[PDB]
Write an enzyme that holds these catalytic residues in place. Structure first.
Site, mmCIF file in Angstrom:
data_model
loop_
_atom_site.group_PDB
_atom_site.id
_atom_site.type_symbol
_atom_site.label_atom_id
_atom_site.label_comp_id
_atom_site.label_asym_id
_atom_site.label_seq_id
_atom_site.Cartn_x
_atom_site.Cartn_y
_atom_site.Cartn_z
ATOM 1 N N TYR A 39 0.823 -1.227 0.000
ATOM 2 C CA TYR A 39 0.000 0.000 0.000
ATOM 3 C C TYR A 39 0.840 1.252 0.000
ATOM 4 O O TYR A 39 1.995 1.233 0.439
ATOM 5 C CB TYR A 39 -0.902 0.001 1.239
ATOM 6 C CG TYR A 39 -0.156 0.142 2.560
ATOM 7 C CD1 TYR A 39 0.045 1.392 3.144
ATOM 8 C CD2 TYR A 39 0.361 -0.988 3.216
ATOM 9 C CE1 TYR A 39 0.725 1.521 4.354
ATOM 10 C CE2 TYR A 39 1.037 -0.863 4.420
ATOM 11 C CZ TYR A 39 1.213 0.386 4.978
ATOM 12 O OH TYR A 39 1.889 0.471 6.177
ATOM 13 N N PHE A 50 2.165 9.512 3.627
ATOM 14 C CA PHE A 50 2.486 9.401 5.039
ATOM 15 C C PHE A 50 2.978 8.005 5.407
ATOM 16 O O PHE A 50 3.530 7.806 6.490
ATOM 17 C CB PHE A 50 1.304 9.828 5.940
ATOM 18 C CG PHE A 50 0.035 9.052 5.681
ATOM 19 C CD1 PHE A 50 -0.130 7.763 6.199
ATOM 20 C CD2 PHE A 50 -0.986 9.613 4.904
ATOM 21 C CE1 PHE A 50 -1.294 7.037 5.958
ATOM 22 C CE2 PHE A 50 -2.175 8.887 4.637
ATOM 23 C CZ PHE A 50 -2.321 7.594 5.159
ATOM 24 N N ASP A 51 2.767 7.038 4.515
ATOM 25 C CA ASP A 51 3.168 5.653 4.790
ATOM 26 C C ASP A 51 3.176 4.865 3.491
ATOM 27 O O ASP A 51 2.284 5.006 2.664
ATOM 28 C CB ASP A 51 2.236 4.998 5.812
ATOM 29 C CG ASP A 51 2.764 3.670 6.344
ATOM 30 O OD1 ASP A 51 3.936 3.302 6.085
ATOM 31 O OD2 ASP A 51 2.015 2.986 7.071
ATOM 32 N N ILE A 70 -7.402 0.181 10.294
ATOM 33 C CA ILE A 70 -8.492 1.157 10.148
ATOM 34 C C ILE A 70 -9.681 0.545 9.404
ATOM 35 O O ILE A 70 -9.527 -0.314 8.549
ATOM 36 C CB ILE A 70 -8.044 2.452 9.436
ATOM 37 C CG1 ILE A 70 -7.391 2.163 8.068
ATOM 38 C CG2 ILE A 70 -7.093 3.240 10.364
ATOM 39 C CD1 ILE A 70 -7.039 3.466 7.259
ATOM 40 N N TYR A 96 -8.760 7.923 10.845
ATOM 41 C CA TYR A 96 -8.374 8.285 12.205
ATOM 42 C C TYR A 96 -9.242 9.396 12.808
ATOM 43 O O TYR A 96 -8.925 9.934 13.881
ATOM 44 C CB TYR A 96 -6.885 8.644 12.253
ATOM 45 C CG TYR A 96 -6.033 7.426 11.959
ATOM 46 C CD1 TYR A 96 -5.806 6.476 12.952
ATOM 47 C CD2 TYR A 96 -5.480 7.212 10.670
ATOM 48 C CE1 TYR A 96 -5.053 5.328 12.687
ATOM 49 C CE2 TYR A 96 -4.719 6.066 10.412
ATOM 50 C CZ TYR A 96 -4.509 5.159 11.435
ATOM 51 O OH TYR A 96 -3.797 3.986 11.236
ATOM 52 N N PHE A 113 -5.553 5.635 -0.257
ATOM 53 C CA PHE A 113 -4.603 4.503 -0.290
ATOM 54 C C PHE A 113 -4.628 3.776 -1.609
ATOM 55 O O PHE A 113 -5.687 3.378 -2.108
ATOM 56 C CB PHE A 113 -4.919 3.448 0.792
ATOM 57 C CG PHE A 113 -4.586 3.861 2.166
ATOM 58 C CD1 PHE A 113 -3.334 3.559 2.718
ATOM 59 C CD2 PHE A 113 -5.534 4.498 2.965
ATOM 60 C CE1 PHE A 113 -3.016 3.921 4.039
ATOM 61 C CE2 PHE A 113 -5.246 4.839 4.264
ATOM 62 C CZ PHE A 113 -3.981 4.566 4.809
HETATM 63 C C1 LIG Z 1 0.365 -0.570 9.055
HETATM 64 C C2 LIG Z 1 -0.891 -1.416 9.203
HETATM 65 C C3 LIG Z 1 -1.625 -1.323 10.536
HETATM 66 C C4 LIG Z 1 -1.638 -2.355 11.479
HETATM 67 C C5 LIG Z 1 -2.330 -2.220 12.676
HETATM 68 C C6 LIG Z 1 -3.046 -1.069 12.948
HETATM 69 C C7 LIG Z 1 -3.060 -0.069 11.989
HETATM 70 C C8 LIG Z 1 -2.324 -0.185 10.812
HETATM 71 N N1 LIG Z 1 -2.292 0.766 9.800
HETATM 72 C C9 LIG Z 1 -3.462 1.092 9.300
HETATM 73 O O1 LIG Z 1 -4.482 0.638 9.796
HETATM 74 C C10 LIG Z 1 -3.445 2.083 8.167
HETATM 75 S S1 LIG Z 1 -1.818 2.357 7.465
HETATM 76 C C11 LIG Z 1 -1.164 3.682 8.430
HETATM 77 N N2 LIG Z 1 -1.879 4.278 9.411
HETATM 78 C C12 LIG Z 1 -1.040 5.240 9.903
HETATM 79 C C13 LIG Z 1 -1.135 6.182 10.936
HETATM 80 C C14 LIG Z 1 -0.046 7.041 11.160
HETATM 81 C C15 LIG Z 1 1.100 6.920 10.370
HETATM 82 N N3 LIG Z 1 1.199 5.992 9.391
HETATM 83 C C16 LIG Z 1 0.140 5.168 9.171
HETATM 84 N N4 LIG Z 1 0.071 4.184 8.237
#
Ligand SMILES: CCc1ccccc1NC(=O)CSc1nc2cccnc2[nH]1
Ligand SMILES: CCc1ccccc1NC(=O)CSc1nc2cccnc2[nH]1
Lengths: 122, 122
Positions: A39, A50-51, A70, A96, A113
């Site tokens: 992703y 941001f990721d 999420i 978020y 995404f």
């Molecule tokens: C990475 C996968 C994961 C595992 C467990 C809990 C949440 C996440 N990330 C996402 O849900 C969305 S991806 C993401 N969510 C973010 C929040 C802040 C900074 N960077 C971020 N990247």
């Protein structure tokens, strides 16, 4: 294609298919299966990334539909089949929310995404 | 035991060993390896649990030392060996900082995680 798929009644999760995946229900992940995805996440407001798992050169695994990630990701990935690549727009409700997350995601941010479903398994 | 291990110079990551893991460097995960962990995260301030892989009955996989997870987790898990269980206290610097993350983690929150290193692999 570039088929647009509405995934929630409130318009909060809308997926655009960039590459269609494989056919069949046997190529569709089931709730509770492990999925492997690549992703790239960016803010809609600024376009800023941001990721990215692609930057890390290694994909990400999670269990589908368990609220580990999420809400937008559970909803989006449940709609995909193996090898599909999509771009999904998520209202903050499916990301978020009002608070945001850390320095890189402000409150009330729409997230975009690009997601590719690489594989899944029991 | 209940050995206390200081993992950063600023005191921001401190691990207490609840169950010691296996011996040897061959039982220690390397940077870039996939690790499988179970965890429970709570706010220090309230004691309230905000996330638990144990509640989901399935552990979580990530690649160690790649910045895929909060800094505190990369630092903590790098110090563990297979089958170790610890409780780690993370200053907000090593979690979600000034902004926090979503509804369940306020800004400037100290996080306490119980982490168990189940296995790791290339
Ligand atoms: C990475 C996968 C994961 C595992 C467990 C809990 C949440 C996440 N990330 C996402 O849900 C969305 S991806 C993401 N969510 C973010 C929040 C802040 C900074 N960077 C971020 N990247
Ligand atoms: C789930 C693993 C993961 C993968 C990719 C990116 C971040 C995470 N989670 C953590 O880093 C810390 S665990 C955690 N961080 C959280 C933030 C808000 C709500 N719940 C949370 N649980």
């Amino acid at each position: 294609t570039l088929e647009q798929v509405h995934l929630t009644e409130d318009g909060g999760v809308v997926k655009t298919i960039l590459r269609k995946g494989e056919g069949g229900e046997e190529n569709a992940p089931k709730k509770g299966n492990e999925v492997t995805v690549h992703y790239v996440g960016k803010l809609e407001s600024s376009g800023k990334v941001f990721d990215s798992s692609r930057e890390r050169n290694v994909p990400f695994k999670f269990h589908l539909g368990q609220g580990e990630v999420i809400k937008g990701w559970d909803i989006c990935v449940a709609s995909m089949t193996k090898n599909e690549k999509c771009s999904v727009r998520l209202d903050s409700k499916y990301g978020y929310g009002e608070e945001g997350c850390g320095e890189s995601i402000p409150g009330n941010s729409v997230l975009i995404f690009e997601i590719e479903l690489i594989s899944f398994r029991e």
